[PDB]
């Protein structure tokens, strides 16, 4: 009848890979604690404490799941960033008196990246001011767009659809002597792409006035 043992954590700390945006109620991992006491003196109750809005836990099986709060690798908030990557877990037996394990157990989640973000322009849309009789091979603008994704998924390149844009630099160069009487205003649709295998794009207008 004496509660002879505390619960004892097993293979802690835990390190786990999880893709971001993983659907709600998707399995993450199963935390495990040991207590050889018979009856309620060894019956365990797991719990996430402090509470984590990105994960739920089966009190009896110690099995963690995701919630209707999606996991976002590009979430700018430092408070959330940590919750998404660190799950602190408390356990107790149901004995008389009830005993906790003498410390919690951290689950370290590694958030794997999806190409879920598209490029977004820093300096577009814009209106570039130029004087007529500007000869060919003159830079007028340099387009900048950023992608919050990781590695190749965040690497932004530039394309169009009387000018040419260098795909690496985002620099916009002329190909002819510009004249007010031929075309005084150009609307140029610059398409910014990333390097994901399902490539994501983003278009905005550079308005050249002569
Ligand atoms: Ca016990
Ligand atoms: Ca992403
Ligand atoms: Ca991207
Ligand atoms: Na994201």
Overall description:
This protein is mainly beta and 210 residues long. Helices cover 4% and strands 39% of the residues. A 4-stranded mixed β-sheet has the order 2-9-8-5. Strand 15 and strand 16 form a beta hairpin. The structure holds calcium ion (3 copies) and sodium ion. One calcium ion is lined by residues 115, 117-118, 147, 149, 153-154, 194, 196, 200.
Question: Could you provide a short overview of the structure?
Answer:
With 210 residues, the protein is mainly beta.
Describe the secondary-structure layout.
Blueprint: E1 8-9, E2 14-19, E3 27-30, E4 33-34, E5 44-48, E6 55-57, E7 63-66, H1 78-85, E8 86-93, E9 105-112, E10 120-121, E11 126-129, E12 139-142, E13 145-146, E14 157-159, E15 163-165, E16 171-174, E17 185-193, E18 201-209
Parallel strand pairs: 2-9, 11-18
Antiparallel strand pairs: 1-4, 3-7, 5-8, 6-7, 8-9, 10-13, 12-16, 14-17, 15-16, 17-18
The structure holds calcium ion (3 copies) and sodium ion.
Sodium ion binds at residues 20, 72-74, 116-117.
> Radius of gyration, Cα only, in angstroms?
28 Å
Element order: H for helix, E for strand: EEEEEEEHEEEEEEEEEEE
Bound molecules: calcium ion, sodium ion
Level-2 CATH architecture of the largest domain: Sandwich
Number of helices: 1
Total E-strand runs: 18
Q: How much β-strand is present in the residues?
A: 35-45%
- Helix-residue proportion: under 10%
**Sheet with the most strands, sense and barrel status:** 4 strands, mixed
Shape: rod-shaped
Structural class: mainly beta
Distance between the termini: 92 Å
- State the CATH topology of the largest domain: Immunoglobulin-like
Q: Specify the CATH class of the largest domain.
A: Mainly Beta
Return the domain count.
2
CATH superfamily of the largest domain: Cadherins
* Strand arrangement, major sheet: 2-9-8-5
